[PDB]
Paper text:
Profilin is an ubiquitous cytoskeletal protein that interacts with several molecules, such as actin, proline-rich ligands, and phosphoinositides to perform several cellular functions. Profilin is also an important allergen present in pollen grains, food plants, and rubber tree, and it is considered a pan-allergen, because it is present in all eukaryotic cells and is therefore involved in allergic cross-reactions. In this work, we focus on the study of two plant pan-allergens, profilins from the rubber tree (rHev b 8) and maize (rZea m 12), in their monomeric and dimeric forms. Here we isolated the monomeric and dimeric species of the recombinant profilin allergens rHev b 8 and rZea m 12 and obtained their crystallographic 3D structures.
Residue numbers in the entry:
A (entry chain A), B (entry chain B): 2 to 131
């Protein structure tokens, strides 16, 4: 049950602070599970993302759009992780063999807190085949 | 705090499974936090651990005991992780710069579930200079 991957793991608490909206989306674009406050993702967004993964950098010019919100594209690992800031908040998106982990934090969560939670779980899924 | 990590982070279930016991522990030997059922480190136990970390392979023929319990060494990462096996149980020792992180699994929890959960936070604390 993906849902508990999203309820009891991405929402797990590190240094007393936990994510705001976690979701596990396929590359095609279909929500496997999402957090109660995870938004609904508008046009091209999962495919736009999917082509900063395929030829990197491409997203930063236009800017990270996720539920139509513009996130400042940050340093990310080519074709594996993409990151973004908006004030004291931002998002990590880890690429999997077949999915996209996605996790949204705000202050007091630190970016590298949100990366640890999100990014490792993907590496775990990239080994459970998905 | 430290008994925050252990009982909340390392005990965060995955796939419905969470560790038997976790501990963060000084490299000298001073426990910073440990779970409830976590054993009690005996004689020359930590010390051997940091040799196979510095001279890898050293502990393995001897075995590697933790609370005087027998873990047959399996393969890990030189000078980073020590993993060990006990039927449907076993243990991972993610070593940070001056500390160790340790988790103990008994199946329905997988080597890989443990593995990631311990190594997850281990690298993290190496980022916050531990």
């Amino acid at each position: 049950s993906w849902q508990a991957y999203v309820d009891d793991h991405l929402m797990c608490e590190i240094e007393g602070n936990h994510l705001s909206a976690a979701a596990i989306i396929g590359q095609d674009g279909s929500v496997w599970a999402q957090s109660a406050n995870f938004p609904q993702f508008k046009s091209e967004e999962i495919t736009g993302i999917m082509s900063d993964f395929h030829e990197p950098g491409t997203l930063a010019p236009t800017g990270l759009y996720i539920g139509g919100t513009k996130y400042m594209v940050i340093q990310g690992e080519p074709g594996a992780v993409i990151r973004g800031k908006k004030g004291p908040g931002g998002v990590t998106v880890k690429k999997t063999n077949q999915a996209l982990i996605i996790g949204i934090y705000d202050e007091p969560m630190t970016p590298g807190q949100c990366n640890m939670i999100v990014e490792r779980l993907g590496d775990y899924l990239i080994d459970q085949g998905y």
